């Protein structure tokens, strides 16, 4: 990844802040349980 | 590391001499041909910070541009093409003052004449004190945009010049944009100046060649 | 009795300084009184009555990094505190007219006596006395 | 060199400063390179403008020199003085 | 050209600085509501701050005026002295416009005092100019009452005592002492002292100091004074919040770190972080719209994704699974039907946190009933957030009588994360306390973190040359450095890159020269060294030889 790196280096507020779980990680967590849910 | 500091008959005539005109040849061609697109790509991406820069300027935070490479062109695009037109077409043509620090012939008294004419309705510090008392009652509206290229310039490094610029940022109706190149630039400012400047720092290193600043110092002396 | 036991000609925690500020001054006195010969011998892992000598800015930062409690690095605050000491006149420069810090020919020296720095190290728990 | 106690003040470094100032006024001491009085007003004009090293270095590190040699001290100081025994080395 | 001039002036929908969130899905109305909500709190914050700042200055001028006119009936004509400890050149003093006595303020900068001759002339020049507006030596002082028919009271403002040549100042003070022969003249002296009285007591002659000590007043004007104003501003920050936002332990931790790095100007640095954090929340977080629970009806499925990823909700879902809650309830909330949890979220918005009320209670209780003032509210609030307030209260021995009252129970309310301030990605450090020296070195070394057919191979010379600078010794034989730099260059690829231009004759003209590679390397080398000269990287030995250079910085320090 490059855009996140340059945003972090530039100190821009466009880059997201990692206080919440990432969208990809939470999506994987939801899907791995939904596939075994029904 | 610091340990790398404690752990530390040829002449230049042995190198082939290059004339002044020959020097400008190779530099100009490679400054355009070499690393053309990636630097332009980085520049275009960096334009996305204009709303954040514009937001920060309105709140009263000076913007300091630092990093490797020339920063004259970046400041020109921001203030002229984005900053000045947007303020006028949103507050309802804002004058922009450009100061060159790379020129060693710059004089602070000549600069202050423009400030008095453009802001003061008709011993420099005493006049600045009058302005602060005037703009207290004035509405918090941006009136003049100030850009100071090379705040580490040879005629600008001096303490008297630094004090003059630092007092200007106290008045909220003036927008200040500055750029520096020296590594020890923060040493030039103590608490009394850093508080007045009210900087917000941005690393804007672009590796842009400094053709303009290279004109005021001869390479033949090397 | 207590009136005569002191002259009281004196005009009257003597210097409120930050943690970064305290180590900055401690490192400088080493530069102003220790020979450059001994910089590598003491600090690398490989005169009280004389007037202080000059030193370069690179010598100060290296020693400051060397004794600061992994590296400390030199952010804006470190230089911000360093310039204030010059403004506070605890460190002197080699000029009197048109002060320009970034001019390479200017050197630095310590304007603080031994007795003041003695008490500074006590609040820091840095044992300067063993370096001489 | 005094018998002790069976169950002379050292003046503080601050109070000596006035004592130190008196000796420079009375010309017992003199600065390391004290040129002194100039001969002409134009020459003195440069002196009144130039700032020497001694005007900037701390009060406790200004180098001085002496007008009276210890031998002359021992020739003049009364033998009743307690520090007479310290006139020599 | 215009760039050759020292300075020159250039003349050139309705924009709102905020930008769309949710990849442009954010509505126009919400941004304006976001724009308006930010202004509401931001203006509310500054109204208390500006009142406090103006109150502080009013107190200072009141005290300064009191000292200047605390008329002491000394039998001897002597100076009136005020020592402004920790002051700056920015402060100002205004005098009474009395009838019988003409009051004039005299400023004395170190630039105006190179010698005693200059001091006397300039002081009289300013005195005459002020006297000229009534309707250059001491004879003007003697002639003043006959010239203008009024008594003269002079106040000398030593705007910066430290930089003043004490030898000149010591002589000038004695010069002013001759004014006591006149009966119509009175003099006052104001000293701007930065560090302490100790600097004065060293450089001034001890005979001079006995003049000042006869009539003097000692005053402190530093902004930092027993957390008296820092607590008030920090509490006012909580007050203007009105419980609509919260603080994390990490954020207060960062504030406590930077507060100790400045001694006399914390308030302006404190204001930077609080406002910048307030700015950050509105620009980044979309849930700032729901500060007012009226705006709840604006929810979309995208907002539920943010709600789904709240730490207090991530484990709450697994609590239902592990406590055998019905799977239909879990299925209903995850597949976003009937969205009943939003009412619980509505409650959290309404729920006032007792943290602010208890802390304000404790602060008032400490100030008024325990009479404790030597304390920091930022530390007090941080211990509350960590839940370690009991240890913090143990600092003071008088808390024993009321530890049960002052004890508080922090609770991690659900969805509080969306309304807390924290330092998590360094966005509050990369732009406010940057590693200015470190960033340049990293950019010089790691160029790939900045930049995204010779361009694909060779990095910029400025960064590449820095590698040799780190490897170089303290002093450099530039000819050897030039050769060393030349050996690293891709000669054949560069020469083939030079030849690519078909019509640039001046480039091809040099390409015929076998020494062009040496010339091209030197042109790149000399230009780079000049850039190194500007950046403070290299310093020449031109007094001995231009062919040797010395390093001026090292990596990682």
> Element (H or E) spanning C87, and its range?
helix C76-87
* Separation between Cα atoms, residue E286 and residue E305, nearest integer Å: 12
Q: Does residue B1 belong to any structural domain of this protein?
A: no
C30 contacts C60 by C-beta, under 8 angstroms: no
* Number of domains into which chain B is organized: 1
Q: For residue E556, list chain B residues with Cβ-Cβ distance below 8 A.
A: 1-2, 4
| Contact at CB, E554 and C58, closer than 8 angstroms | yes
* Nearest residue in chain A measured CA to CA from E446: A9
**Hey, are the CB atoms on A12 and B49 less than 8 Å from each other?**
yes
By residue range, what is the domain housing residue B56? Answer: 35-222
- Cα separation, E483 vs E499, whole angstroms: 23
Q: Are C70 and E428 in contact (CB under 8 A)?
A: no
d(CA E196, CA C14) in angstroms, rounded, equals 7
DSSP for E431-475, written as a single string: TTS--HHHHHHHHHH-GGGT---GGGTPPPHHHHHHHHHHHS-SE
Residue-wise DSSP of chain D: ------------TTTHHHHHHHHHHTTSEEETT---S-SSHHHHHHHHH---GGGTS-TTS--EEESS-HHHHHHHS-TTSGGGGGS--
Does a structural domain hold residue B190? yes
Sign of CA dihedral E469, E472, E473, E475: negative
For residue B133, tell me if it sits in a domain.
yes
φ, ψ of residue B112 to 5 degrees: the values are -65, -25
DSSP structure class, residue A22:
P
The rounded distance, in Å, linking the Cα atoms of E368 and E371 is 5
**Smallest Cβ distance to E510: which of B22, B33, B93?**
B22
Tokens for E246?
């919260």
Q: Which helix (H) or strand (E) holds E267?
A: helix E266-284
The residue among C51, C90, C117 with the most chain D CBs within 10 A of its CB, best to mutate, is C51
Q: In 10 A of CB D24, how many CB atoms? A: 14
Nearest residue to B192 (alpha-carbon basis) of E232, E85, C88, C97: C88
- Tell me how far CA of residue E197 lies from CA of C12, E83, E157, E194, in angstroms: 7, 8, 17, 9
Quick one: angle between helices E266-284 and B50-59, nearest 10?
140
CA distance B3 to chain C (A): 6
Q: Is residue B171 part of a domain?
A: yes
Say whether B15 and E504 touch across the interface (CB within 8 A).
Answer: no
| Residue ranges of C 50-89 with Cβ closer than 8 A to chain D | 51
Experimental determination technique: cryo-EM
Instruction: Label the pairing between strands E545-551 and E475-477.
Output: antiparallel
Within chain B, how many helices (H) and strands (E) appear?
Answer: 10, 5
Domain assignment present for residue B210? The answer is: yes
Tokens of E258: 């930077």
State the Cα–Cα distance between residues B9 and B182, nearest whole angstrom: 31
C50 touches chain E (CB under 8 A): no
What is the DSSP-derived secondary structure letter of residue C129?
G
Element (H, E) at E189: strand E185-193
Containing B45, the helix (H) or strand (E) segment is helix B36-46
Residue E300 contacts residue E25 (beta carbons within 8 Å): yes
Assigned token pair, C1: 């009795």
Contact B149, E3 (CB under 8 A): no
Beta bridge pairs of residue E8: B98
Are the CB atoms for E108 and E159 separated by under 8 Å? Answer: yes
* Distance from the Cα of residue E489 to its chain's centroid: 44
> Is B18 inside a domain boundary?
no
Structure tokens at E525: 């080398």
Stretch (H or E) spanning B195: helix B191-197
Q: List chain B residues with CB under 8 Å of A4.
A: none
Whether residue B204 lies inside any domain: the answer is: yes
Nearest of B88, B149, B141 to residue B119 by alpha carbon: B141
Rg (chain C; Cα; Å):
17
d(C-alpha E525, C-alpha B23), whole Å: 11
Decide if E8 contacts B148 (C-beta within 8 A): no
Question: Phi and psi at residue E246, in whole multiples of 5°?
Answer: -130, 170
B25 domain-assigned: no
Residue E499 CA to residue D64 CA, distance in Å, equals 72
Q: C75 vs chain D: nearest CA distance in angstroms?
A: 31
Nearest CA in chain B to C101: B188
B130/B170 Cα distance (integer angstroms): 12
Write the residue in C71, C77, C90 that is nearest to E261 by C-beta. C77
- The DSSP call for residue E158 is E
* A10 touches B: beta carbon within 8 Å: yes
Q: In chain C, which residues have their Cβ closer than 8 Å to the Cβ of E435?
A: 73-75
Q: Say how far residue B128 (Cα) sits from the centre of its chain.
A: 21
Per CB-CB distance under 8 Å, the chain B contacts of C79 are 184, 186-187
B112 touches C at CB < 8 Å: no
Please give the Cα distance from C57 to C86 (Å, whole number): 13
**Residues E518-544, buried b or exposed e (16+ Cβ, 10 A)?**
bbbbbbbbbbbbbbbbbbbbbbbeeee
Residue A37 tokens read as: 């849910």
Kindly state whether A38 is in contact with chain B, defined as any CB-CB distance less than 8 angstroms: no
Best residue of B63, B115, B222 to probe chain E, by most E CBs closer than 10 Å: B222
E485, E489, E527: best to mutate for the B interface, most B CBs within 10 A:
E527
């Amino acid at each position: 990844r490059y855009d996140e790196i340059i945003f972090r280096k530039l100190g821009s507020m466009l880059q997201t802040t990692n206080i919440l779980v990432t969208d990809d990680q939470y999506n994987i967590w939801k899907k791995r349980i939904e596939m075994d849910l029904a | 590391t610091f340990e790398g500091y404690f752990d530390q008959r040829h002449t230049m005539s042995m190198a082939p001499d290059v004339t002044r005109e020959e020097f400008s040849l190779v530099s100009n061609f490679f400054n355009e041909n070499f690393q053309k697109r990636p630097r332009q790509k980085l520049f275009e991406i960096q334009k996305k910070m204009f709303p954040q820069y514009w937001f920060e300027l309105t709140q009263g935070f000076s913007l300091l541009f630092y990093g490797v490479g020339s920063k004259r062109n970046f400041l020109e695009e921001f203030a002229i093409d984005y900053l000045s037109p947007k303020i006028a077409y949103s507050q309802l043509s804002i004058p922009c003052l450009i100061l060159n620090g790379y020129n060693p012939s710059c004089n602070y008294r000549d600069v202050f004449k423009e400030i008095t004419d453009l802001l003061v309705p008709a011993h420099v510090i005493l006049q600045i004190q009058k302005m602060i008392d005037f703009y207290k009652n004035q509405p918090l509206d941006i009136k003049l945009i100030l850009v100071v290229h090379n705040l580490d310039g040879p005629s600008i490094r001096k303490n008297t010049f630094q004090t003059m610029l630092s007092f200007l940022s106290v008045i909220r109706q003036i927008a200040i944009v500055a750029s520096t190149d020296h590594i020890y630039a923060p040493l030039l400012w103590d608490n009394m100046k850093a508080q007045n400047y009210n900087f917000v720092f941005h690393d804007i290193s672009n590796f842009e060649p400094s053709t303009v600043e290279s004109t005021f110092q001869d390479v033949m002396k090397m | 009795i207590k009136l005569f036991l002191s002259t009281d000609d004196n005009l009257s925690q003597t210097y409120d300084l930050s943690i970064i500020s305290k180590y900055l001054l401690i490192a400088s006195y080493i530069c102003s009184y220790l020979e450059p010969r001994y910089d590598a011998s003491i600090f690398s892992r490989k005169p009280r009555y004389l007037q202080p000598s000059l030193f370069a800015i690179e010598r100060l930062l290296a020693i400051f990094q060397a004794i600061f409690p992994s590296l400390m690095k030199a952010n804006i605050e470190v230089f911000q505190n360093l310039s204030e000491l010059h403004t506070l006149k605890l460190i002197a420069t080699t000029m009197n007219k048109n002060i320009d810090y970034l001019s390479p020919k200017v050197r630095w020296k310590v304007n603080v006596p031994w007795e003041i720095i003695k008490e500074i190290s006590e609040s820091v728990h840095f044992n300067i006395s063993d370096y001489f | 060199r005094i018998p002790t106690v069976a169950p002379i003040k050292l003046w503080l470094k601050k109070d000596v400063k006035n004592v130190w100032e008196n000796l420079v006024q009375l010309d017992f001491f003199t600065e390391k390179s004290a040129v002194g009085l100039r001969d002409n007003a134009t020459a003195a004009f440069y002196a009144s403008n130039y700032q020497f090293q001694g005007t900037m270095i701390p009060f406790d590190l200004r180098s001085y020199q002496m007008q009276i040699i210890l031998q002359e001290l021992r020739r003049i100081i009364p033998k009743s003085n307690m520090y007479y025994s310290w006139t020599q080395l | 050209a215009d760039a050759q001039r020292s300075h020159y002036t250039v003349y050139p929908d309705k924009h709102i600085p905020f930008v769309k969130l949710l990849s442009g899905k954010e509505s126009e109305v919400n941004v304006e509501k976001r724009w308006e909500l930010y202004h509401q709190l931001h203006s509310h914050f500054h109204d208390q701050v500006d009142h406090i700042i103006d109150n502080i200055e009013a107190d200072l001028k009141a005290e300064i005026s009191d000292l200047l006119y605390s008329e002491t009936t000394q039998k001897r004509r002597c100076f009136n002295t005020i020592f402004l400890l920790g002051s700056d050149s920015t402060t100002k003093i205004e005098l009474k416009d009395e009838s019988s006595r003409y009051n004039v303020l005299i400023e004395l900068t170190p630039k105006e005092s190179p010698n005693v001759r200059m001091m006397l002339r300039r002081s009289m020049y300013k005195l005459y100019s002020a006297a000229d507006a009534e309707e250059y030596d001491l004879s003007l002082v003697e002639n003043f009452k006959r010239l203008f028919g009024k008594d003269l009271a002079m106040v000398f403002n030593f705007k910066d005592v430290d930089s003043i040549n004490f030898n000149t100042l010591d002589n000038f003070i004695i010069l002013l002492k001759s004014a006591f022969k006149y009966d119509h003249v009175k003099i006052s002296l104001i000293f701007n002292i930065n560090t302490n009285l100790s600097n004065i007591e060293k450089n001034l002659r001890q005979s001079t100091i006995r003049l000042l000590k006869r009539n003097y007043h000692k005053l402190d004007v530093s902004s930092n004074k027993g957390f008296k104003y820092g607590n008030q501003i920090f509490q006012s920050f909580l007050d203007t919040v009105d419980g609509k936002l919260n603080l994390s332990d990490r954020f207060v931790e960062f504030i406590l770190s930077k507060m100790a790095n400045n001694t006399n100007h914390n308030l302006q640095l404190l204001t930077k972080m609080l406002d910048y954090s307030l700015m950050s929340y509105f620009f980044q977080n979309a849930f700032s719209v729901f500060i007012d629970p009226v705006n709840v009806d604006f929810l979309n499925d995208d907002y539920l994704k943010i709600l789904s990823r709240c730490p207090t909700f991530m484990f709450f879902v697994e609590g239902l699974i592990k406590q055998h809650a019905p799977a239909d309830e879990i299925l209903s909330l995850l597949t976003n039907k009937n969205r009943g949890l939003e009412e619980f979220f509505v409650e959290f918005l309404v729920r006032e946190n007792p943290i602010n009320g208890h802390a304000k209670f404790v602060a008032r209780f400490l100030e008024e009933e325990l009479n404790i003032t030597n304390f920091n509210l930022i530390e007090l609030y941080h211990n509350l957030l960590i839940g370690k307030l009991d240890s913090y209260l143990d600092r003071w021995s008088a808390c024993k009588e009321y530890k049960d009252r002052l004890h508080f129970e922090p609770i991690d309310t659900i969805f509080q994360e969306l309304f807390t301030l924290d330092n998590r990605s360094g966005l509050l450090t990369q732009s406010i306390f940057p590693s200015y020296k470190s960033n340049i070195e990293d950019n010089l070394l790691s160029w790939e973190q900045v930049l995204p057919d010779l361009d694909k191979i060779m990095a910029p010379v400025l960064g590449q040359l820095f590698k040799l600078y780190r490897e170089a010794n303290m002093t450099i034989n530039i000819y050897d450095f030039y050769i060393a730099f030349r050996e690293t260059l891709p000669k054949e690829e560069i020469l083939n890159f030079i030849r690519k231009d078909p019509s640039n004759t001046k480039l091809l003209e040099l390409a015929e020269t076998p020494d062009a590679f040496d010339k091209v390397a030197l042109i790149l080398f000399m230009q780079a060294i000049f850039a190194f000269e500007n950046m403070g990287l290299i310093k020449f030995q031109s007094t001995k030889s231009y062919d040797l250079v010395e390093k001026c910085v090292w990596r990682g320090i």
